[model samples]
Target: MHHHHHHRSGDIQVQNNNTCNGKTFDYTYTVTTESELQKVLNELKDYIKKQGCKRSRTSITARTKKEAEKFAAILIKVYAELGYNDINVTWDGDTVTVEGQLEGVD
Candidate 1:
């Protein structure tokens, strides 16, 4: 199904698919300011809920490792757009790690 998310500072579109055979079949597009992180997170929360994958406390899941990796790649792209290209994106098992300066986005 097609979905969308919007907030005061930015908006995003979450394209999802359940027929990936556990492959990378999803994407999240976010375009906005840094102050809108919380909004993006909130939208992620709601999106996960709609997808019925609530076993995750962070709107992320490992039901399919490929999906996770693909999602991380998209996140890396978003980070680059945010001027964080120096960051390294890695996934060992289900743990997604962003190493380098300006990491964690925290």
Candidate 2:
């Protein structure tokens, strides 16, 4: 079964690929408040640690498809708030990862 969930944040299109596993989808979202966004980011950090997965500014890994999509949804919103664009989310093996480009970063 293939399902697609799409959300738009300004010029970014966030697609939730519910039917595909281990495939990356690019998307973005807007956060209305700083504290709300901060809480989500903190949740992500804690989840990564609890899963014993490696993570960096641009990537994260964890087991399971749910985790992958959850991570992506959280990140796409967060990074868009921070002015990053084209956030991509994917999972393979035991990793749920995200990558994107910041408007001011190289």
Candidate 3:
């Protein structure tokens, strides 16, 4: 009995050998509201801090410019808080790139 891969019970399709701590871009989510997105970034910042991670990326396909704007606002807030102004968001077409870094102070 030789199966090529072991299956875990989860929705994530990641098939790389990298450990969880080795990830640089492991998050994705929908564009919702200011308060909701803020809370997620707040918590995500905490995770990045303890793990000493840096320049991790998250992407979103915004259905509206309004949603893209929302990502810009909160992404800045969290970046300044977590990365001392290095948090960045880039926009092109319907896609938004959100990035955060945990740097030397940790």
Best by TM-score: 3
lDDT of each: 0.42, 0.44, 0.52
For candidate 2, write residues 17-84 as lDDT tens digits.
21122223212223334354446465544433444232234343345676566555766675455444
Off by over 4 Å in 3: 1-21, 29-33, 100-106
Arranged by lDDT, best first: 3, 2, 1
**lDDT score, candidate 3:** 0.52
Q: Residues 1-106, candidate 1: write the lDDT tens digits.
A: 3334545432322333333233242434453333343456445445544553412222222225775565555545544443434646555554454333445565
Task: Mark the 10 consecutive residues where model 1 has the least summed lDDT.
Answer: 54-63
Alpha carbon RMSD to native, model 3: 9.9
Colliding residue pairs in candidate 2: 14-27, 62-96
Q: List the residue pairs that clash in candidate 3.
A: none
Q: Determine the C-alpha RMSD for candidate 2 after optimal superposition of all C-alphas.
A: 13.5
Which structure among the candidates has the greatest lDDT? 3
- Using all chains and alpha carbons, the TM-scores for the candidates as numbered come to 0.33, 0.37, 0.57
